[PDB]
C-alpha cells in the first residue's frame, strides 16, 4: 500500500482494504468482450466441472502477486503485464463470468 498499479488498484477496488489478497488479475479489455468468452471454447475447469470457457484470442492482463515481504496492513505486490488466453467459469442467465480459472 504504496505506489505501482497493483498496489493502487487492489486498494481502490477494495481487495486489500481489509486483508492482503495473494493474487489478482486485471483484464484490460472491454467488459462485454470478457463476457463474450462464455460462448467461446468450452473446456473442463481444474475441478473437472465443464462450465469453463477459454478465450479464442489472447487479452492484455496485469497479474498482481503479493511479494514474500508483504504483511497487512502494508500489502506489497509485484506487477507483471502479459497477453494471455483467459479461462473463465460462467453461470446464470445471462451466462456471465463469475470466476477466473486461469490464463494460458
Amino acid at each position: 500500500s504504496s505506489s505501482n498499479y497493483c498496489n493502487q488498484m487492489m486498494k481502490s477496488r477494495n481487495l486489500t482494504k481489509d486483508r492482503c489478497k495473494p493474487v489478482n488479475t486485471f483484464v484490460h479489455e472491454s467488459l462485454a468482450d470478457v463476457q463474450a468468452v462464455c460462448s467461446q471454447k468450452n473446456v473442463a475447469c481444474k475441478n473437472g466441472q465443464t462450465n469453463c470457457y477459454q478465450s479464442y484470442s489472447t487479452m492484455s492482463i496485469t497479474d498482481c502477486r503479493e511479494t514474500g515481504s508483504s504483511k497487512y496492513p502494508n500489502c506489497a505486490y509485484k506487477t507483471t503485464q502479459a497477453n494471455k488466453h483467459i479461462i473463465v467459469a460462467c453461470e446464470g442467465n445471462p451466462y456471465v463470468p463469475v470466476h477466473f480459472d486461469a490464463s494460458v
Binding site: 488498484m9 477496488r13 477494495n14 481487495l15 489478482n24 488479475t25 486485471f26 483484464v27 484490460h28 479489455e29 472491454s30 467488459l31 470478457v34 496485469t62 453461470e91 446464470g92 456471465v96 463470468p97 463469475v98 470466476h99 477466473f100
Partner: peptide
C-alpha cells in the same frame, strides 16, 4: 448486495 457476476467485474475489470 453484490452478485457474483458484479464481484467478478469489480475484482477483474479494467475497461
Amino acid at each position: 448486495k453484490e452478485t457474483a457476476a458484479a464481484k467478478f467485474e469489480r475484482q477483474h475489470g479494467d475497461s
